[PDB]
Amino acid sequence: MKGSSHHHHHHSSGASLVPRGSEGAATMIEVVCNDRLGKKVRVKCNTDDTIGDLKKLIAAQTGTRWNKIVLKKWYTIFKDHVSLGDYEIHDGMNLELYYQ
């Protein structure tokens, strides 16, 4: 008695030229994914994009799998339901990049 998986669908889309960040806060901040390759990895994202969305990019930038990217800070685990707006991530925040 056991299963796995549920559904597979996405609902995202990027719009060129921020159409005014009214109500829905969407600020741009640079993140630094500290990899274990030696060289750091920076990426551009907005607070509107959650860790998941971010991870996706990272995996897109690095080439890894969005499902193979873990963002940790000191001793804090980042969920896929917590955005940057919650972590108040600052433009240039160094986070521990880890691969599953």
Residue whose entry in the numeric block shows the structure tokens 């640079």: 30
Pairwise CA distance, residues 75 & 27, whole Å: 26
Pairwise CA distance, residues 28 & 68, whole Å: 24
Nearest alpha carbon to residue 42 among 53, 29, 25, 52? 29
Q: What is the DSSP string of 57-90?
A: HHHHHH---GGG-EEEETTEE--SS-BHHHHT--
Count of domains for the chain: 1
The dihedral built from the CA positions of residue 69, 65, 88 and 86, taken in this order, carries a sign that is negative
CATH number at residue 98: 3.10.20.90
As beta bridge partners, residue 83 has: 50
Instruction: Count CA atoms closer than 13 A to 63's CA, side-chain side.
Output: 0
| Structure token pair of residue 67 | 């499902």
Nearest alpha carbon to residue 18 among 48, 58, 42? 48
